């Protein structure tokens, strides 16, 4: 889709640290909760991410749920150029 | 259904003309560079963007629209 890499980074970055994204199925929202971009940029970016593997999608009541996968982990590792064994949603926080 | 009504003359998209980009950086005498196409004074345009020269017109293209400078 058409969008500046500037907004691509906010998605690609936030997907790496938090490991999971949610998004209501309503384009024209103009600002995602928790992200700095238009809602539309999110949904179609993850859709692009999903269709080359890298992430699964669930819908269930008008809200996409996106699950970053293992094969995805290395891709945006490249795209964020962070080194091998940086992080994911894969941290047991302290003692919980 | 009722396919294909269409009185003629279909519409075209934009083209984005080729315009092999600026040598509009005239150097004078090896290599005093005189920098044609006066730049823009808005802090979002860090003076690297220039002003388009139409009639009654100096337009900042980097501002997708904003700020008509008049000279």
């Amino acid at each position: 889709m058409l969008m500046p890499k500037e907004d691509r980074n906010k998605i690609h970055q936030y997907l790496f640290q938090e490991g999971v994204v949610v998004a209501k199925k309503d384009f024209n929202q103009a600002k995602h909760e928790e992200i700095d971009t238009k809602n539309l940029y999110v949904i179609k970016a993850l859709q692009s991410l999903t269709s080359k593997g890298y992430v699964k999608t669930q819908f269930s009541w008008q809200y996409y749920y996106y699950t970053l996968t293992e094969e995805g982990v290395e891709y945006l590792r490249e795209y964020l150029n962070l080194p091998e064994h940086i992080v994911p949603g894969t941290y047991i926080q302290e003692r919980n | 259904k009722k396919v294909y009504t269409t009185p003629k003359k279909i519409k075209h998209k934009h083209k984005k003309v080729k315009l092999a980009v600026l040598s509009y950086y005239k150097v004078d005498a090896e290599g005093k560079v005189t920098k044609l196409r006066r730049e823009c004074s808005n802090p979002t345009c860090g003076a690297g963007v220039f002003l388009a020269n139409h009639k009654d017109r100096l337009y900042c293209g980097k501002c997708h629209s904003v700020y008509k400078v008049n000279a």
Binding site: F16, Q17, L82, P83, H85, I86, V87, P88, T90, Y91 | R38, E39, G46, A47, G48
Partner: peptide, 26 residues
């Protein structure tokens, strides 16, 4: 296991010398 905690890796790799800034003539 699989350390360095990306949420804070931008905060440890937050050392400078990764930019440049100069403008404003005429």
């Amino acid at each position: 296991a699989k350390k360095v905690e990306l949420d804070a890796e931008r905060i440890e790799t937050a050392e400078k010398e990764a930019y440049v800034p100069a403008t404003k003539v005429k």
